[PDB]
Amino acid sequence: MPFKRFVEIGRVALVNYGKDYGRLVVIVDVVDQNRALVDAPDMVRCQINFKRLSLTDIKIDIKRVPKKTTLIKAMEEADVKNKWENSSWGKKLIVQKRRASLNDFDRFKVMLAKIKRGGAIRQELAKLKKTAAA
Amino acid sequence: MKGRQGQRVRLYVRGTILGYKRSKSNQYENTSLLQIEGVNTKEEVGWYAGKRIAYVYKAKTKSNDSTIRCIWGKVTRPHGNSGVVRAKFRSNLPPTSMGKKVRV
Amino acid sequence: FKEANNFLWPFKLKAPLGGLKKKRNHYVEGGDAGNRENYINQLVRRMN
Amino acid sequence: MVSGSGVCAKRVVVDARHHMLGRLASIVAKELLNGQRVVVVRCEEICMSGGLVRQKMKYLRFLRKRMNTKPSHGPIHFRAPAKILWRTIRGMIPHKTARGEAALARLKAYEGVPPPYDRTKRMVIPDALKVLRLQPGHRYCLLGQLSKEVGWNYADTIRELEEKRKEKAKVSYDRRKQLAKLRVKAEKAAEEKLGTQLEILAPIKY
Amino acid sequence: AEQYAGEYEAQDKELVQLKREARMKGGFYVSPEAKPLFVVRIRGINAMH
Amino acid sequence: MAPTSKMALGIKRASRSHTYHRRGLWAIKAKHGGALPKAEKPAAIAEPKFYPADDVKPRTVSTRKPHPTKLRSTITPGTVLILLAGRYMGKRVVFLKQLQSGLLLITGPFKINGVPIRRVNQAYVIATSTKVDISKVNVQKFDDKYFAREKKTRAKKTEGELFESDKEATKNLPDFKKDDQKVIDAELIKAIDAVPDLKNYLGARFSLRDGDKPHEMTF
Amino acid sequence: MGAFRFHQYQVVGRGLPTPTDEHPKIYRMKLWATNEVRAKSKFWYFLRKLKKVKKSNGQILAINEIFEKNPTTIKNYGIWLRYQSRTGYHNMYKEYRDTTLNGAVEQMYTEMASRHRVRFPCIQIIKTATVHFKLCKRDNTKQFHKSDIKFPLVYRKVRPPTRKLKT
RNA sequence: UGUUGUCGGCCGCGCCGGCGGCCAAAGCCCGGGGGCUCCGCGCCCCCGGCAGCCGUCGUCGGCACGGCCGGGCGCGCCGAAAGGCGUGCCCCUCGGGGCACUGCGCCAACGGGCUCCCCAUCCGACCCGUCUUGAAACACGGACCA
RNA sequence: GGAUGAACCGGAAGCCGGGUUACGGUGCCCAACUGCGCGCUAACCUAGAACCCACAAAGGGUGUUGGUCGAUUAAGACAGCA
RNA sequence: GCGCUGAAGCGCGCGACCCACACCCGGCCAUCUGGGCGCCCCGAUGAGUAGGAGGGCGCGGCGGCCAUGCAA
């Protein structure tokens, strides 16, 4: 792909790498067809030439031109978009992150136990199949 | 682009070989036992099973056997699981090539 | 103290850690050769 | 980043559909050198970037070369897409040494599907084509579009491709119709699912 | 080294701004530097006179 | 650098104190250094040799320094170790050897009829409340006198002391079985209860001796 | 900004010289560079180019940089420029859309390299000139960006923006 | 005789933090003026208070690992352990700090070589000797050995 | 290191061991990136310091990108049709 | 070489890596610095044809010393 490149606001974007070490961003100022200023509420602004930083589906409700206070206000209005963000499209990383945190005792018993039950569910599910089948 | 999903993959990373056991009379094959210094994360051993360890056979550096043999095995299984791991090598190694730093 | 140097007599430096940027080039082009106050102190702290 | 096709201790099935021939061959040669036993499937559906005439001249300089100069015995040229892929592997591997020849002999390339490897074939980490001919980005050529202009094995291969595709479409259509039924009674029994104290901390780790 | 620069701030006031935002560079005065050296021989003795 | 600054900053300072206690007693440690010591028969030769004393004393100290410290990095007690899981009560094992971390040898006695011993990559071990000064080294496999029963009754007292903590603590009892299942291991949570030791350690110390020398083994 | 592109170095100086009533008189010529290493060198090209001096008959008083000047923010820089290709150096007057002074060099080095072909030995430019947005004359990328600032057109090409994933 | 834990030295590694350099400053909130665009938005610039934190030089501060090689410390008491327990000075005058004050001696655990072949890898360009500026040499000399 | 290679580059070597590098290189063969930001090319140009060894000229090219200057424009252009 | 093409080409920047016998480091061989008691030690440089200069190995018979031999 040459892709989305531009020049507009409201469109959240998600990272294809850099320093930071973060990161999700939305584009505040738009400043030809390569260069753009991306910022976030609790993330640092950067002006990048950013072909290879790709923009996600979920879009946040703001109009064109954002200084800092305005951006904050927009974020407050939205939020919700971050949840979609924790989950899903780009976005994903809070559900994944929930994954990484887990090779650890308390964490390992919570797991055998999800498992143990999962089994009980397989068994109920299987019984159901048998009644349905014939 | 690359559509970063990804996974991570990083070269790091050093480790040392503990010692390589070449045994027969005729039932067993060969073992190598490996220690990475700290590295792979409990998650990153676990998610994986499947480390390639590639160690360069580099002059190290008296006059060494500098040959165009870079050897890369695979890590079979933890035995050590939060540290040390078992490994095997498929060509078979250089001389007593125990010791030398292991890398990916 | 121009004759306190009169050292004893050459420093035997380690090859630099992580290398040069290339040897065939001067300071202007991002190379190593030539005069440079900053980068000598970088280079000697690589040559440990 | 992690290469998501690559190592398995034993597998090895590769999908060649709209993959890039030299990119797929490069990973396959590395899996073969590692001691894997590699089966590339759908060799007819694999892609090479570049404009048809210029791909056609490369192979054609081999085709005038097929004729002459003559004992017999090789230099030799394979008409057909698996065997073109095999010719590509026998340049990718160091092709004068027992370790390389033993790696070559662990490859098979099969056209369509062999009779059934119904364990799915898997895609190589972005080997695949769409973009790598870029939108536009001029032409690409399929190996089954090259080998129609070079000959059988191809021709039988694309006729057997057709039948194996038509029957496995029919068999897929109905297995999907039962799988959807199984999914719907499975999801309702996760919507229901009895209770917890331990059990719902796991779906708070999706 | 701070005092060598330091008179150059303390008297001066023409040096920083105009200078960011405009070209040429200033009249007045300058402070000197010294300074001794170290030499390490990067290139070997093969093919030089 | 942060540990290593502290050592400097006399020099010696306690070692300037040490002399003093001898100076205080009264008047001394030139005479006693010169006048002493033993000698004179013997047989043969150069007498090039040796040991006990003064170097050996830094080498034991020196060897003591990883030893806390590797536990600060990895957390726990030391050896002696209990099956948490398996049998509700049951019995006690000591880590005599690492093939590795993970592959471990867990121990006991056998002099008449005996007792096994396992090498495992796991099966069943989480640690207790005791520390020694080894890491995880001794072995081959030795012990014996009363001690299928004693080591074991030492087990019962720890298994009671543990079983109560396993009731108070766990997530429950079923993956204390997964923790016991693991056995590399290790970091997360370590120190619960089981108070005190004084016997537990005395017992562990004997176990180390028993998996050492000199019994049953000599020809 | 992160791993440079060319911060302009304000060198004030001298020319320190002789027992004759002469002496050299004052300069900046304000040069874009990566820190002192480029300066030293930059002066010998300025001193060879304008005045002829020596190396020694340039003495340098002080250096001041510029620290984020632009605050990230913008202009489409008019550059008066020299590229060496199939002979010596040819003049060019390039006015192009950019971020900043960090970016302008690269877009020139890449356009002098591709567009103009330039290979290593080359030295830089003559000047870089801010201009106003409505004013920017010639041509393609910048004209569109000028239009984007207008607006309507911040909010045009969202019209691919928000049109990859879908609405 | 073989192995494994370690204390000491050497080098490598990644990460974190502070201060000064660019009189510090992006900055933001407050307050005042100018310009462009004169279709208005929006853009810009300058000055004072002020959350704030930045990319780079220099420097210092804190940790954790590996590889290789080898085996300064005590001399009364308590303290498993590490550690403190003699006294004077001074800064801070808080926690504490540095500074000063005889001689002598000198580790743990456990129970092989070589020949030919095969596979990997390189020399590889024979060797070898000679001739030659240059030898594998399609330059010369040898069947092989005693 | 340069596919091979007396004299190009790195480099001047007792033997060994380990560490880091130089030149040069990092898709596979082949250790190590299918590295980052950007831009040009679609001819398989093209994977090339140097070499008897790697050719390509005078001259031409509305291919394509890019820079600039003059004039003409809603006091309606350029072209086409009428 | 396989052979790529929004690059595995090209150019402008850049990050991390790889890689010698080099350079460091450890231990050791000559000469020389010298030192110290026929012997020990500290550090440096230390490829090699023609070739000079010097120490040593082996052959055969002779002499003085000193043995070995029914299994040389």
mmCIF file of N, CA and C (backbone and C1' of nucleotides) in Angstrom, chain H residues 10-42:
data_model
loop_
_atom_site.group_PDB
_atom_site.id
_atom_site.type_symbol
_atom_site.label_atom_id
_atom_site.label_comp_id
_atom_site.label_asym_id
_atom_site.label_seq_id
_atom_site.Cartn_x
_atom_site.Cartn_y
_atom_site.Cartn_z
ATOM 1 P P C H 10 40.429 -5.417 37.572
ATOM 2 O "O5'" C H 10 40.473 -6.080 36.154
ATOM 3 C "C5'" C H 10 41.605 -5.990 35.291
ATOM 4 C "C4'" C H 10 41.442 -6.610 33.872
ATOM 5 C "C3'" C H 10 40.154 -6.205 33.105
ATOM 6 O "O3'" C H 10 40.424 -4.916 32.515
ATOM 7 C "C1'" C H 10 40.156 -8.401 32.950
ATOM 8 P P C H 11 39.375 -3.796 32.323
ATOM 9 O "O5'" C H 11 38.432 -4.468 31.272
ATOM 10 C "C5'" C H 11 39.041 -4.545 29.955
ATOM 11 C "C4'" C H 11 38.144 -5.354 29.002
ATOM 12 C "C3'" C H 11 36.688 -5.029 28.728
ATOM 13 O "O3'" C H 11 36.479 -3.940 27.831
ATOM 14 C "C1'" C H 11 36.908 -7.322 29.236
ATOM 15 P P G H 12 35.151 -3.071 27.891
ATOM 16 O "O5'" G H 12 34.005 -4.060 27.372
ATOM 17 C "C5'" G H 12 34.026 -4.530 25.974
ATOM 18 C "C4'" G H 12 32.861 -5.494 25.792
ATOM 19 C "C3'" G H 12 31.437 -5.059 26.127
ATOM 20 O "O3'" G H 12 30.983 -4.301 25.045
ATOM 21 C "C1'" G H 12 31.677 -7.159 27.038
ATOM 22 P P C H 13 29.806 -3.234 25.110
ATOM 23 O "O5'" C H 13 28.617 -4.022 25.729
ATOM 24 C "C5'" C H 13 27.767 -4.787 24.830
ATOM 25 C "C4'" C H 13 26.541 -5.466 25.481
ATOM 26 C "C3'" C H 13 25.534 -4.626 26.146
ATOM 27 O "O3'" C H 13 25.626 -3.254 25.958
ATOM 28 C "C1'" C H 13 26.309 -5.824 28.025
ATOM 29 P P G H 14 24.935 -2.034 25.342
ATOM 30 O "O5'" G H 14 23.421 -2.218 25.426
ATOM 31 C "C5'" G H 14 22.470 -3.232 25.043
ATOM 32 C "C4'" G H 14 21.412 -3.442 26.129
ATOM 33 C "C3'" G H 14 20.807 -2.230 26.864
ATOM 34 O "O3'" G H 14 19.728 -1.740 26.071
ATOM 35 C "C1'" G H 14 21.458 -3.623 28.494
ATOM 36 P P C H 15 19.480 -0.094 26.120
ATOM 37 O "O5'" C H 15 18.937 0.069 27.662
ATOM 38 C "C5'" C H 15 17.616 -0.589 27.968
ATOM 39 C "C4'" C H 15 17.304 -0.431 29.431
ATOM 40 C "C3'" C H 15 17.308 0.954 30.092
ATOM 41 O "O3'" C H 15 16.075 1.632 29.807
ATOM 42 C "C1'" C H 15 18.456 -0.473 31.579
ATOM 43 P P C H 16 16.171 3.249 29.853
ATOM 44 O "O5'" C H 16 16.423 3.446 31.422
ATOM 45 C "C5'" C H 16 15.322 3.156 32.280
ATOM 46 C "C4'" C H 16 15.614 3.438 33.713
ATOM 47 C "C3'" C H 16 16.039 4.889 34.128
ATOM 48 O "O3'" C H 16 14.870 5.664 34.142
ATOM 49 C "C1'" C H 16 17.499 3.436 35.185
ATOM 50 P P G H 17 14.984 7.219 33.807
ATOM 51 O "O5'" G H 17 15.969 7.756 34.978
ATOM 52 C "C5'" G H 17 15.434 7.788 36.296
ATOM 53 C "C4'" G H 17 16.441 8.300 37.270
ATOM 54 C "C3'" G H 17 17.053 9.701 37.047
ATOM 55 O "O3'" G H 17 16.134 10.717 37.345
ATOM 56 C "C1'" G H 17 18.743 8.377 37.519
ATOM 57 P P G H 18 16.229 12.213 36.798
ATOM 58 O "O5'" G H 18 17.550 12.754 37.489
ATOM 59 C "C5'" G H 18 17.478 13.139 38.900
ATOM 60 C "C4'" G H 18 18.825 13.643 39.360
ATOM 61 C "C3'" G H 18 19.442 14.939 38.650
ATOM 62 O "O3'" G H 18 18.719 16.026 39.148
ATOM 63 C "C1'" G H 18 21.099 13.627 38.701
ATOM 64 P P C H 19 18.630 17.372 38.372
ATOM 65 O "O5'" C H 19 20.127 17.951 38.387
ATOM 66 C "C5'" C H 19 20.692 18.526 39.536
ATOM 67 C "C4'" C H 19 22.115 18.912 39.267
ATOM 68 C "C3'" C H 19 22.334 19.890 38.070
ATOM 69 O "O3'" C H 19 22.192 21.223 38.527
ATOM 70 C "C1'" C H 19 23.764 18.203 37.553
ATOM 71 P P G H 20 21.715 22.387 37.599
ATOM 72 O "O5'" G H 20 22.904 22.565 36.542
ATOM 73 C "C5'" G H 20 24.125 23.234 37.027
ATOM 74 C "C4'" G H 20 25.350 23.234 36.057
ATOM 75 C "C3'" G H 20 25.098 23.826 34.568
ATOM 76 O "O3'" G H 20 25.191 25.202 34.592
ATOM 77 C "C1'" G H 20 26.047 21.709 34.482
ATOM 78 P P G H 21 24.793 26.151 33.434
ATOM 79 O "O5'" G H 21 25.383 25.472 32.211
ATOM 80 C "C5'" G H 21 26.723 25.859 31.696
ATOM 81 C "C4'" G H 21 27.150 24.964 30.504
ATOM 82 C "C3'" G H 21 26.696 25.389 29.091
ATOM 83 O "O3'" G H 21 27.464 26.467 28.599
ATOM 84 C "C1'" G H 21 26.579 23.180 29.255
ATOM 85 P P C H 22 27.132 27.839 27.392
ATOM 86 O "O5'" C H 22 25.601 27.556 26.911
ATOM 87 C "C5'" C H 22 25.162 28.416 25.834
ATOM 88 C "C4'" C H 22 24.223 27.766 24.836
ATOM 89 C "C3'" C H 22 22.793 28.124 25.251
ATOM 90 O "O3'" C H 22 22.752 27.952 26.743
ATOM 91 C "C1'" C H 22 22.743 25.751 24.436
ATOM 92 P P C H 23 22.154 28.726 27.494
ATOM 93 O "O5'" C H 23 22.832 30.151 27.850
ATOM 94 C "C5'" C H 23 23.489 30.280 29.164
ATOM 95 C "C4'" C H 23 23.274 31.622 29.958
ATOM 96 C "C3'" C H 23 22.187 31.614 30.964
ATOM 97 O "O3'" C H 23 22.566 30.868 32.079
ATOM 98 C "C1'" C H 23 22.279 33.736 29.868
ATOM 99 P P A H 24 21.504 30.476 33.195
ATOM 100 O "O5'" A H 24 20.461 29.616 32.384
ATOM 101 C "C5'" A H 24 19.260 30.157 31.818
ATOM 102 C "C4'" A H 24 18.972 29.557 30.427
ATOM 103 C "C3'" A H 24 17.507 29.384 30.010
ATOM 104 O "O3'" A H 24 16.920 30.660 29.716
ATOM 105 C "C1'" A H 24 18.735 27.455 29.251
ATOM 106 P P A H 25 15.361 30.814 29.411
ATOM 107 O "O5'" A H 25 15.130 29.801 28.253
ATOM 108 C "C5'" A H 25 14.534 30.072 26.993
ATOM 109 C "C4'" A H 25 14.432 28.765 26.183
ATOM 110 C "C3'" A H 25 13.124 28.032 26.426
ATOM 111 O "O3'" A H 25 12.056 28.604 25.664
ATOM 112 C "C1'" A H 25 14.802 26.387 26.689
ATOM 113 P P A H 26 10.629 28.065 26.108
ATOM 114 O "O5'" A H 26 10.223 27.068 24.970
ATOM 115 C "C5'" A H 26 10.541 27.132 23.586
ATOM 116 C "C4'" A H 26 10.415 25.738 22.949
ATOM 117 C "C3'" A H 26 8.941 25.390 22.882
ATOM 118 O "O3'" A H 26 8.292 26.056 21.789
ATOM 119 C "C1'" A H 26 10.193 23.422 23.676
ATOM 120 P P G H 27 6.720 25.809 21.672
ATOM 121 O "O5'" G H 27 6.309 25.556 23.175
ATOM 122 C "C5'" G H 27 5.394 24.499 23.414
ATOM 123 C "C4'" G H 27 5.122 24.263 24.894
ATOM 124 C "C3'" G H 27 4.074 25.129 25.597
ATOM 125 O "O3'" G H 27 2.781 24.630 25.317
ATOM 126 C "C1'" G H 27 5.883 24.992 27.204
ATOM 127 P P C H 28 1.673 25.339 24.448
ATOM 128 O "O5'" C H 28 0.511 25.480 25.512
ATOM 129 C "C5'" C H 28 0.145 24.397 26.395
ATOM 130 C "C4'" C H 28 -0.035 24.756 27.805
ATOM 131 C "C3'" C H 28 -0.925 25.931 27.811
ATOM 132 O "O3'" C H 28 -2.334 25.469 27.715
ATOM 133 C "C1'" C H 28 1.182 26.437 29.078
ATOM 134 P P C H 29 -3.312 26.483 26.933
ATOM 135 O "O5'" C H 29 -3.246 27.572 28.167
ATOM 136 C "C5'" C H 29 -4.124 27.176 29.245
ATOM 137 C "C4'" C H 29 -3.846 28.159 30.426
ATOM 138 C "C3'" C H 29 -3.889 29.668 30.187
ATOM 139 O "O3'" C H 29 -5.193 30.225 30.071
ATOM 140 C "C1'" C H 29 -2.019 29.283 31.510
ATOM 141 P P C H 30 -5.484 31.449 29.140
ATOM 142 O "O5'" C H 30 -4.989 32.555 30.134
ATOM 143 C "C5'" C H 30 -5.651 32.890 31.336
ATOM 144 C "C4'" C H 30 -4.885 33.987 32.134
ATOM 145 C "C3'" C H 30 -4.525 35.231 31.317
ATOM 146 O "O3'" C H 30 -5.751 36.032 31.204
ATOM 147 C "C1'" C H 30 -2.477 34.674 32.241
ATOM 148 P P G H 31 -6.021 36.870 29.872
ATOM 149 O "O5'" G H 31 -4.813 37.879 29.844
ATOM 150 C "C5'" G H 31 -4.978 38.852 30.958
ATOM 151 C "C4'" G H 31 -3.801 39.839 30.890
ATOM 152 C "C3'" G H 31 -3.688 40.604 29.533
ATOM 153 O "O3'" G H 31 -4.557 41.799 29.480
ATOM 154 C "C1'" G H 31 -1.799 39.628 30.000
ATOM 155 P P G H 32 -5.176 42.125 27.994
ATOM 156 O "O5'" G H 32 -3.932 42.741 27.279
ATOM 157 C "C5'" G H 32 -3.402 44.026 27.652
ATOM 158 C "C4'" G H 32 -2.214 44.408 26.827
ATOM 159 C "C3'" G H 32 -2.236 44.461 25.315
ATOM 160 O "O3'" G H 32 -2.889 45.660 24.849
ATOM 161 C "C1'" G H 32 -0.480 43.536 25.673
ATOM 162 P P G H 33 -3.760 45.702 23.541
ATOM 163 O "O5'" G H 33 -2.648 45.614 22.417
ATOM 164 C "C5'" G H 33 -1.764 46.773 22.337
ATOM 165 C "C4'" G H 33 -0.637 46.580 21.276
ATOM 166 C "C3'" G H 33 -0.803 46.209 19.766
ATOM 167 O "O3'" G H 33 -1.202 47.365 19.068
ATOM 168 C "C1'" G H 33 0.799 44.899 20.542
ATOM 169 P P G H 34 -1.890 47.300 17.598
ATOM 170 O "O5'" G H 34 -1.073 46.227 16.778
ATOM 171 C "C5'" G H 34 0.079 46.869 16.176
ATOM 172 C "C4'" G H 34 1.030 45.903 15.482
ATOM 173 C "C3'" G H 34 0.563 45.183 14.256
ATOM 174 O "O3'" G H 34 0.120 46.079 13.248
ATOM 175 C "C1'" G H 34 1.975 43.966 15.262
ATOM 176 P P G H 35 -1.078 45.539 12.355
ATOM 177 O "O5'" G H 35 -0.409 44.619 11.249
ATOM 178 C "C5'" G H 35 0.744 45.084 10.475
ATOM 179 C "C4'" G H 35 1.538 43.888 9.972
ATOM 180 C "C3'" G H 35 0.802 42.972 8.956
ATOM 181 O "O3'" G H 35 0.907 43.586 7.663
ATOM 182 C "C1'" G H 35 1.805 41.721 10.694
ATOM 183 P P C H 36 -0.333 43.376 6.705
ATOM 184 O "O5'" C H 36 -0.324 41.923 6.237
ATOM 185 C "C5'" C H 36 0.907 41.450 5.653
ATOM 186 C "C4'" C H 36 0.776 39.944 5.418
ATOM 187 C "C3'" C H 36 -0.412 39.462 4.593
ATOM 188 O "O3'" C H 36 -0.077 39.467 3.233
ATOM 189 C "C1'" C H 36 -0.445 38.146 6.666
ATOM 190 P P U H 37 -1.076 40.013 2.131
ATOM 191 O "O5'" U H 37 -2.289 39.016 2.410
ATOM 192 C "C5'" U H 37 -2.458 37.693 1.763
ATOM 193 C "C4'" U H 37 -3.607 36.835 2.356
ATOM 194 C "C3'" U H 37 -4.983 37.425 2.444
ATOM 195 O "O3'" U H 37 -5.734 37.205 1.231
ATOM 196 C "C1'" U H 37 -4.511 36.594 4.680
ATOM 197 P P C H 38 -6.278 38.437 0.442
ATOM 198 O "O5'" C H 38 -7.064 39.265 1.555
ATOM 199 C "C5'" C H 38 -8.446 39.018 1.774
ATOM 200 C "C4'" C H 38 -9.214 40.138 2.454
ATOM 201 C "C3'" C H 38 -9.402 41.402 1.598
ATOM 202 O "O3'" C H 38 -10.716 41.842 1.621
ATOM 203 C "C1'" C H 38 -8.605 42.114 3.828
ATOM 204 P P C H 39 -11.815 41.486 0.504
ATOM 205 O "O5'" C H 39 -12.435 40.207 1.131
ATOM 206 C "C5'" C H 39 -13.473 40.324 2.102
ATOM 207 C "C4'" C H 39 -14.082 39.017 2.607
ATOM 208 C "C3'" C H 39 -13.280 38.395 3.736
ATOM 209 O "O3'" C H 39 -13.733 38.980 4.952
ATOM 210 C "C1'" C H 39 -13.652 36.636 2.078
ATOM 211 P P G H 40 -12.890 40.113 5.686
ATOM 212 O "O5'" G H 40 -12.569 39.472 7.067
ATOM 213 C "C5'" G H 40 -13.542 39.016 7.957
ATOM 214 C "C4'" G H 40 -13.761 37.463 8.165
ATOM 215 C "C3'" G H 40 -12.660 36.827 8.944
ATOM 216 O "O3'" G H 40 -12.864 37.109 10.375
ATOM 217 C "C1'" G H 40 -13.133 35.518 7.156
ATOM 218 P P C H 41 -11.735 36.400 11.294
ATOM 219 O "O5'" C H 41 -12.344 35.027 11.776
ATOM 220 C "C5'" C H 41 -11.477 33.876 12.150
ATOM 221 C "C4'" C H 41 -11.882 32.496 11.462
ATOM 222 C "C3'" C H 41 -10.802 31.421 11.617
ATOM 223 O "O3'" C H 41 -10.957 30.656 12.796
ATOM 224 C "C1'" C H 41 -11.097 31.581 9.346
ATOM 225 P P G H 42 -9.911 30.692 14.039
ATOM 226 O "O5'" G H 42 -8.619 30.123 13.360
ATOM 227 C "C5'" G H 42 -8.562 28.825 12.711
ATOM 228 C "C4'" G H 42 -7.489 28.840 11.604
ATOM 229 C "C3'" G H 42 -5.974 28.954 11.865
ATOM 230 O "O3'" G H 42 -5.406 27.726 12.275
ATOM 231 C "C1'" G H 42 -6.457 30.315 10.340
#
